[PDB]
Design a protein around this nucleic acid. Structure first.
Ligand SMILES: [Zn+2]
Length: 1843
RNA sequence: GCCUAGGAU
RNA sequence: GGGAUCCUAGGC
């Protein structure tokens, strides 16, 4: 700790500015050794610096020797009788007036004003005495709120502050030095404030340690470049390059890379694109539609022809009851559970049959028994026979099988009921019959014969003949297929609620167990199409791809397939949507005369496409549709890339895709049809929207492993050609790695072009020195700016999951073990063999025997091994055997298992474990267990000393120890759990599966806590958690800080098409990157053109675009490939080290540049990790290929790259190359680079030709808007235009920026960020928004999905979607919700919306509309009543007799009280009876990824106790339904769409408060919602609704639009917050963004409306819309800075009268009403400043802190007197704004509270000095104002003022 | 492979 | 990716 004081003493000796006035305390601090002495001297030094800086900035000389005002005056030559001893911190005299000063620091507005008022009273108590010598005193006060002075570098400042606080943090010393008051004041003074600068300059508190490796890098980055070239010079180089390029090109030495377009060739190649197996020339629609319906199982089932055709049985009740019993894990699943449970349902069906001849619940020999299981009957009889036989033998080794069977039945049923009756309710709802069990049944069982069909499931494919129906019977134009598909998809989705059961029959014995299988069956689901039923059958549960089978009763097993439950979602219940989609889509192109005939064919084709998408959803069918957009984009263009068509040829596997290809090719050939020309825009829209029919599938991933391998290959494969791949770089970098790094850094800049015997070689990384020098020089010469930059010099730019590492020692592991991994792989392989491999290969194959040997090796139960030796593989096993043998030979803190030591009946424990496995501890149920059990458990735990001290404290155990004695057992049980932290292999597998990892993961905040808790300032700030904290390093090498290097990790982010990469960091990597990110973004913010962060740029982009397509100017829409993995931080550093910013200052520039150099140098050395499963799978491939068990495909380069390093020893773990930039990490710097480079390139092209170009960017995309000249030239000299484009390609390639083959050039479209535009018409996107809105449901409260879908629909409607679609979607969602039977309240969603209900409505306005529609003739007067009420209130007549009198008050008859307080008749007596059931009127509903799983979770959660009691309990929803159904005065009511709302009588409104506690009346909610919305929106929403019939039909062309705008002081809000709720205000706005502790507000206008609005609220963009003017008719319409400147003026004027204050840069700015350099133009309120205009400009709006002199109006300072400005005994000028009644009211309120003579004198003086200027007072009153202000004594004050 | 009793899912 | 039984003891 001594080193701390040492180094800080060194700093304060060095960096302290030379001034002898600091020397004294300097000495006093540089000599002490006692801690307390050092703290005192340091704090005194800091306060001295503060007061010095203050007295300098104000203009008062520093009282150094600490004189006294008596002495201060008497040594100045005046007489002073006697004073009280006061010590000033500075003073000054001017003639007969005096100026004092006093300053301090306080960081809390509560403890701020105290010092202010104390100093003011201490000064006035001396002014009163001073007044009698004819001398004026002016008591200045200053209130700085930070110790950040100006004579001291700030990093030294806080480096001193924190070490002082630490030395002060001696516990014993702090205690035995002072009390808690001053301790608390001091600790919050060294608060480690975030300061005013960036947060990286703190680097200067650490060593350099930059010995040798850091030099040559900078040299190379600075060696060849020449960043000084003049402006004119660059023209020469540019011209020479252009000339040599054109010359060497025209002679045909380089390619052309660009082709002109022709529709013929494009169509021809698009047709013959896949021409190797689509043996077709032309296409007939008829044969197509014919062979479609007979394609594949689902299709052949849909369009088929089937189905030309309540009992309260005794098979359901039993089943429901047994299901419920099974749910709770009561019974021990042991040697034979489910068999008896099957026998019981067998007897149930037997009994039920012979009474009413039921025909249900049966397929051949099958019956859905318990958990959707479909058992046979024969094997049941056999196993029952065998069971009773061996049981009789056990009785032998008397009774008959009947007797023992009924005995078991009686025993199990009795145990069942006995367990149930502990807590569970009984037969009361379970209406069962104990006659089912006959006194003899086993015989009756053995005499049951049913005949029928047999069930089968066929795995392998078949032929198209086992289908016993007639294929083509349905028709396209009808909508049966969609409903069949909906039903089937729902039957699929529902296949997840099954729980993993325990099978009964292995069902097969032999390798045919994957061939057609039928002995028994397994689980099954039920669904109805129109008439009869159908069973859907599967075998194993979960959510993994498997087989299925569709069984029926009249025939067996219509088909079978290979689907997967998820990914089939977005079709359920949505049938009348898709049809409407297709219809409105067709509706566009239906007027093309040249297409009149075969139009119906188009219809069929469109429909067919959609059904195909829905029937066979698969990965590689998405990209085919997506890529289509680029083709159509190319069609309308002019020039396209040379190598385009070879992109749309990815990969196809099975047939269906080729069917889709043929269909779409036919449709394109028919739509395009070169001999038709009429409607181009509509066909454009049609095809384009057809291309977006890809989102309909899903966004998820098909697999995991082969999804990770792809991304890993994408990562690695391009970093190998360049020839630089390091491996396992240790934290201490050896020399060879540094050497290779230098060599590669040199190689990177070795690019060349157009001057060589080889010419340019595209598609290879690197930058050439010529172009880089040209760029840098042309940038430094200011040849890339405009007036918005030359006039504004660039100010200094300095003013999810996270990985947790492992640890074995000081070091950190970085390499997996070899032999451990070998053992792991072997084990896994043995598992794979044991599960499936053993049932596929023959026993006389060598591979089978090998696997057998390796399995009996690894677990417990040579001529073959000799042949193995002859098969080469000899030594591999010889070593591996002993290796893994030795690996396998090598292998009281309170916990959860201890429960088994207390609770003997385990069933309770299983209950508890389930409940915890569902809900948190905080919301555990009270009634899961018997009430006595809690007390008995608490007793049995408090007895046993062990667990007692393990959870009780004898001296969080405190809260439990205390509560147990007080006998609140439930809180005790919950607490003991909150401590419990519940929230044949011969070795241990899990330990191995954990040892051979390296990195683990954690959430965002779980680590932020564990960080912030281990430091002083518990306010999370950037530069506090890595610089000044425990566990941080001291110095740093050229590689990284002494903690280590910058790790990372890999994963994938999924989208449509392919998947992008995802880097993940640790805490430190994030913390350090964030600084560079913020820096570069702040820097880019000054320059115009970027569009990644801003908003008001993107709209300018859109406006420029829309403007471009009116004159046919040639747009150029680009893109960029491999942007991520082909950028390098070396390039950023190199272009930075040559950047020269503002040239006025000298050093801080290079300081920042060096800091950034160090940061980038750290970043260049990252150590990317490699995932685990990738390594496991590749090792598996290796160990296979070694023996070559199953020869796979020919290995790519990655497998060899691995195996090479693998069969030498080392297993590759980390790779640290140079070539790759982070993918998504270093965004802002990449955008900066792209912007600068693009501007330079456009500059060059301007230099060559005679035109201009405008561009933009987000991260890699771009546009280019050719000027008029470059457009109009293109039509005469195509050669020159093409060569310009080519030279652009070349140049832009030289700077390491490529162009993807999908860019285009055109005159008819313009693309940006996927937002297309055309002339005249506009292009919507229907399919995208529809497919988005179809699946956006998760497992939240059903009151949130409402606003979710409402937001989605509001966003969509703005883009030309027609509203009918939206209503259909809303109805679909409501039906999906009703499927779970959640009783729909009134306001859940408004399924009636219109076109006015979005463009001018909120989320709730539509609620008001549905209510208005529901129950009229009541609101028809409530509206007028609220209208009168609001009209009266808006002018503030009562303004309080409603909020604090009615709103909070009990809504009992308050309405009638309003109606009598306003004079309108109250409602009827049969009005209050309306209400609406609200679940969760006490506490929100308790709750217990993907989408399907989310939906099944939401479907499950409802049932299981979604109800909280009065205090805390649990119930159901059916319960409350019954308990309402009891009371015979409660009448429900429904609407057409379905909206429950009730009628309950006021006569029993009380007297039965049991269930009625939930209900809530409707008109109350209507009133309050209406008032709130009206206050918020425009008050026009309280007219009278109406429907119009004033229109005749007009021929509505399908494309016609009409843009629209929606129909709509923060300082005052903040004022009211600080005036009403101070505690909430200080802790939520000041630390967020504010510093206004030293600010006054005692003179500010007030508003009553806003005040009461805020009191209620605390008590209780969307630019344009684009719609069709063919809809705008059928609707309804309803019937109805200068301020701030004048506020500051009146504030100053009012303060001028209360006292006298000096006018300086700190007095004025200290107020609140002031334009503190906000968004204000040059001249806005400068006319309303009088004598203060120039000061704001010349002084305030430049950063100049000085006092006011006489030269500031056109050497004594100025004094603000009453109204007019005064110098020493003379007036120069004045100013006086206008006053109002309310301002005077607030004035006389706040001033005339305690004293009187002050108000009288002030008013008299104001009247006097305002009369002598002859202004007029006739505009206001006096007497009534006084009365309204002083309600009891206005007479005497009237007399006083008027006298 | 079976019966009884229990434990774990 | 596509069929769930494991341990200990007692009588066998
Ligand atoms: Zn029946």
């Amino acid at each position: 700790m001594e080193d701390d004081m040492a180094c800080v003493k060194d700093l304060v000796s060095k960096y302290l500015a030379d001034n002898e006035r600091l020397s004294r305390q300097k000495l006093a601090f540089l000599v002490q050794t006692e801690p307390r002495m050092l703290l005192m001297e340091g704090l005194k030094l800091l306060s001295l610096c503060i007061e010095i800086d203050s007295c300098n900035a104000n203009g008062c000389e520093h009282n150094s020797e600490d004189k006294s005002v008596e002495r201060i005056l008497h040594d100045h030559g005046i007489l002073t009788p006697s004073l009280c001893f006061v010590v000033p911190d500075g003073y000054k005299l001017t003639g007969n007036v005096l100026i004092l000063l006093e300053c301090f620091v306080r960081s809390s507005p509560a403890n701020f004003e105290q010092k202010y008022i104390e100093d003011f009273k201490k000064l006035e108590q001396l002014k009163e005495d001073l007044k009698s010598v004819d001398i004026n005193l002016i008591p200045l006060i200053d209130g700085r709120t930070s110790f950040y002075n100006e004579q001291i570098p700030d990093w030294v400042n806080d480096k001193l502050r924190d070490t002082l606080f630490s030395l002060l943090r001696y516990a014993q010393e702090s205690n035995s030095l002072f009390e808690e008051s001053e301790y608390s004041r001091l600790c919050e003074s060294l608060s480690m404030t975030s300061g005013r600068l960036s947060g990286v300059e703190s680097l200067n508190v650490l060593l350099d340690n930059r010995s040798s490796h850091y030099e040559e890098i900078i040299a190379s980055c600075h060696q060849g470049i020449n960043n000084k070239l003049t402006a004119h010079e660059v023209k020469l180089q540019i011209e020479e390059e252009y000339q040599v390029f054109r010359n060497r090109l025209r002679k045909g030495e380089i390619t052309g890379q660009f082709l002109k377009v022709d529709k013929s060739r494009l169509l021809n190649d698009f047709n013959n694109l896949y021409v190797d197996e689509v043996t077709a020339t032309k296409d007939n629609i008829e044969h197509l539609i014919y062979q479609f319906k007979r394609a594949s199982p689902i299709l052949r089932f849909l369009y088929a022809n089937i189905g030309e055709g309540i009992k309260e049985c005794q098979m359901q009740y039993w089943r429901s009851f047994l299901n419920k019993v099974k749910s709770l894990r009561i019974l021990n699943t042991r040697r034979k559970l489910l068999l008896i449970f099957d026998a019981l349902i067998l007897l149930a069906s037997i009994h039920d049959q012979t009474r009413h001849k039921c025909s249900k619940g049966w397929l051949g020999s099958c019956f859905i028994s318990v958990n959707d299981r479909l058992v046979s009957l024969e094997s049941t009889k056999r196993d029952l026979e065998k069971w009773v036989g061996r049981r009789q033998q056990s009785e032998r080794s008397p009774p008959d099988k009947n007797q023992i069977l009924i005995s078991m039945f009686q025993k199990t049923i009795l145990k069942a009921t006995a367990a149930l009756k502990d807590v569970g309710i009984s037969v009361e709802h379970y209406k069962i019959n104990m006659e089912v069990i006959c006194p003899d049944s086993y015989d009756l069982i053995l005499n049951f014969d049913v005949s029928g069909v047999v069930p089968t499931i066929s795995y392998q494919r078949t032929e198209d003949e086992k289908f016993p129906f007639i294929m083509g019977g349905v028709e396209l134009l009808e909508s049966t297929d969609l409903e069949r598909l909906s039903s089937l998809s729902l039957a699929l989705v529902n296949s997840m609620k099954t729980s993993s059961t325990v099978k009964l029959r292995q069902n097969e014995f032999g390798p045919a167990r994957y061939q057609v299988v039928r002995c028994k069956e397994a689980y099954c689901q039920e669904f109805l199409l129109s008439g009869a039923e159908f069973q859907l059958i599967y075998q194993k549960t979960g959510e993994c791809s498997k087989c299925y089978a569709i069984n029926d009763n009249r025939v067996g097993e219509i088909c079978s397939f290979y689907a997967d439950p998820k990914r089939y979602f977005p079709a359920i219940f949505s049938a009348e949507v898709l049809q409407t989609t297709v219809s409105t889509m067709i509706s566009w192109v239906k007027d093309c005369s040249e297409l009149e005939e075969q139009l119906c064919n188009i219809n069929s084709l469109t429909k067919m496409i959609l059904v195909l998408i829905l029937a066979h959803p698969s990965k590689r069918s998405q990209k085919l549709l997506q890529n289509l957009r680029y083709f159509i984009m190319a069609y309308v263009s002019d020039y396209h890339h040379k190598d385009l068509i070879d992109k749309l040829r990815e990969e196809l596997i099975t047939d269906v895709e080729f069917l889709l290809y043929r269909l779409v090719r036919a449709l394109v050939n028919l739509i395009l049809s070169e001999d038709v020309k009429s409607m181009m825009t509509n066909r454009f829209k049609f095809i384009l929207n057809i291309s977006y029919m890809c989102h309909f599938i899903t966004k998820e991933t098909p697999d995991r492993l082969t999804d990770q391998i792809k991304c890993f290959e994408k990562f690695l494969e391009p970093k190998l050609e360049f020839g630089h791949v390091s491996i396992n770089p240790a934290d201490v970098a050896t020399e060879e790695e540094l050497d290779d790094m230098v060599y590669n850094a040199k190689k990177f800049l070795s690019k060349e072009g157009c001057t060589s015997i080889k010419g340019p070689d595209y598609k290879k990384p690197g930058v050439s020195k010529r172009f880089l020098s040209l760029l840098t020089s042309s940038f430094n010469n200011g040849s890339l700016f405009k007036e918005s930059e030359v006039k504004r010099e660039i100010k200094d730019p300095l003013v999810k999951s996270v990985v947790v590492n492992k640890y074995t020692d000081g070091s950190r592991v970085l390499n997996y073990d070899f032999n451990k991994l070998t053992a792991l792989a072997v084990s896994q392989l043995t598992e794979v063999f044991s599960r499936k491999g053993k049932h596929l290969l023959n026993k006389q194959d060598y591979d089978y025997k090998v696997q057998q040997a390796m399995s009996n090796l690894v677990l417990g139960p040579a001529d073959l091994d000799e042949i193995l030796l002859d098969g080469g593989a000899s030594v591999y096993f010889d070593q591996l055997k002993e290796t893994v043998e030795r690996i396998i030979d090598q292998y009281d803190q309170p916990s959860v298992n201890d429960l088994d030591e207390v609770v003997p009946n385990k069933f309770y424990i299983r209950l508890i474990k389930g409940e915890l496995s569902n809900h948190m501890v905080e919301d555990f149920d009270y009634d899961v267990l018997p009430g006595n059990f809690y007390e008995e458990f608490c007793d049995a735990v408090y007895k046993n000393n062990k667990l007692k001290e393990r959870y009780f404290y004898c001296g969080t155990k405190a809260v439990a120890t205390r509560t147990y004695f007080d006998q609140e057992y439930f809180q005790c049980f919950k607490s003991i759990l909150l401590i419990m932290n519940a929230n044949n292999f011969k070795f241990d597998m899990g330990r191995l599966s954990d040892d051979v990892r390296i990195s683990e993961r954690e959430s965002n905040s779980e680590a932020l806590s564990k960080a912030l808790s281990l430091t002083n300032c518990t306010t999370a700030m950037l530069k506090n958690l890595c610089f000044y904290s425990q566990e941080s390093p001291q110095s740093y090498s050229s590689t990284g800080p002494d903690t280590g290097r910058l790790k990372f990790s890999l994963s994938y982010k999924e989208q449509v098409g392919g998947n992008r990469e995802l880097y993940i960091g640790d805490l430190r990597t994030k913390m350090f990157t964030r600084l560079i990110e913020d820096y570069f973004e702040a820097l880019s913010l000054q320059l115009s053109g970027s569009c990644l962060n801003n908003e008001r740029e993107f709209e300018n982009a859109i406006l420029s675009m829309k403007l471009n397509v009116s004159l046919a100017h040639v747009s150029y829409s680009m893109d960029h490939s491999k942007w991520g993995p082909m950028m390098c931080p070396f390039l950023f550093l190199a272009t930075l080290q040559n950047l020269i910013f503002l040239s006025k200052d000298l050093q801080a520039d290079i300081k920042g540049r060096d800091y950034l150099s160090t940061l980038l140098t750290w970043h260049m050395h990252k150590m990317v990790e490699i995932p685990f499963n990738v390594v496991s799978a590749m090792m598996k491939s290796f160990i296979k290929a070694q023996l070559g068990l199953k020869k796979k495909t020919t290995q790519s380069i990655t497998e060899d790259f691995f195996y090479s390093n693998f069969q030498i020893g080392v297993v590759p773990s980390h790779v640290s190359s140079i070539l790759d930039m982070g993918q998504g990490i270093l965004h802002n710097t990449s955008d900066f680079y792209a912007l600068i480079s693009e501007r330079f390139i456009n500059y060059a092209i301007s230099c060559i030709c005679g035109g201009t170009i405008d561009a933009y960017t987000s991260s890699d995309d771009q546009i280019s808007l050719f000027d008029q000249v470059l457009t109009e030239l293109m039509q005469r000299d195509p050669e020159e235009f093409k060569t310009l484009i080519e030279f652009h390609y070349y140049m832009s390639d030289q700077l390491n920026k490529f162009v993807s083959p999908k860019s285009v050039i055109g005159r008819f479209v313009a693309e940006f960020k996927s937002r297309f535009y055309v002339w005249g018409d506009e292009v919507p996107l229907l399919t995208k928004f529809v497919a988005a809105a179809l699946h956006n449901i998760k497992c939240k409260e059903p009151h949130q999905l409402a606003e979710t879908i409402d937001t989605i629909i509001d966003q969509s409607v703005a883009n030309g979607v027609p509203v009918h679609l939206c209503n259909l979607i809303q109805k679909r969602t409501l039906s999906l919700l009703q499927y779970a039977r959640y009783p729909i309240d009134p306001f859940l969603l408004n399924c009636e919306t219109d076109v006015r209900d979005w463009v001018d409505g909120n989320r709730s306005y539509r609620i008001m509309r549905q209510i208005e529609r529901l129950i009229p003739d009541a609101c028809g007067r409530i509206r007028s009543m609220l209208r009168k009420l609001y009209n009266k209130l808006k002018t503030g007549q009562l303004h309080e007799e409603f909020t604090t009198n009615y709103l909070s008050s009990e809504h009992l008859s308050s309405l009638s009280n309003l109606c009598e307080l306003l004079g309108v008749e109250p409602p009827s007596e049969s009005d209050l009876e309306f209400s609406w059931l609200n679940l969760a009127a006490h506490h929100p509903l308790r709750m217990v990824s993907s989408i399907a799983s989310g939906f099944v979770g939401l479907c499950r959660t409802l049932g299981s106790k979604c109800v909280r009691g009065p205090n805390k309990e649990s119930l159901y929803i059916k319960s409350i339904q019954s308990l309402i159904s009891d009371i015979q005065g409660i009448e429900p009511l429904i609407d057409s769409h379905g909206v429950q709302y009730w009628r309950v009588p006021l006569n029993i409104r009380d007297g039965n408060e049991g269930v009625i506690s939930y209900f809530r009346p409707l008109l109350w909610d209507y009133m309050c919602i209406s008032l709130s919305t009206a206050i918020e929106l425009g008050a026009w929403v309280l007219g009278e609704p109406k429907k119009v019939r004033v229109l005749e039909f007009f021929k509505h062309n399908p494309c016609d639009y009409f843009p629209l705008k929606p129909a709509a002081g923060l300082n005052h809000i903040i004022h009211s917050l600080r005036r009403l709720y101070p505690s909430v205000f200080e802790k939520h706005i000041l630390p967020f963004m504010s510093d206004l502790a030293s600010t006054k507000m005692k003179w500010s206008p007030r508003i009553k409306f806003l005040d009461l609005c805020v009191a209620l609220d605390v008590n209780c963009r969307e630019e344009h819309y684009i719609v069709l003017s063919s809809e705008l008719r059928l609707s309804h319409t309803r019937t109805h800075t200068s301020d701030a400147v004048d506020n500051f003026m009146r504030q100053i004027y009012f303060e001028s009268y209360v006292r006298s204050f000096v006018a300086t840069t700190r007095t004025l700015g200290s107020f609140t009403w002031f334009p503190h350099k906000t968004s204000v133009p040059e001249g806005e309120g400068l006319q309303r400043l009088g004598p203060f205009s120039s000061f704001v400009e010349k002084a305030i709006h430049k950063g100049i802190e000085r006092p006011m002199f006489k030269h500031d109006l056109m050497p004594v300072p100025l004094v603000v007197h009453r109204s007019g400005l005064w110098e020493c005994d003379k007036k120069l000028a004045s100013f006086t704004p206008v006053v109002q009644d309310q301002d005077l009211e607030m004035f006389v309120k706040e001033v005339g509270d305690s004293s009187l003579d002050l108000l009288i004198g002030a008013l008299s003086a104001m009247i006097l000095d305002r009369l002598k200027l002859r202004m007029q007072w006739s505009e206001v009153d006096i007497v009534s104002m006084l009365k309204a202000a002083m309600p009891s004594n206005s007479v005497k004050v009237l007399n006083a003022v008027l006298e």
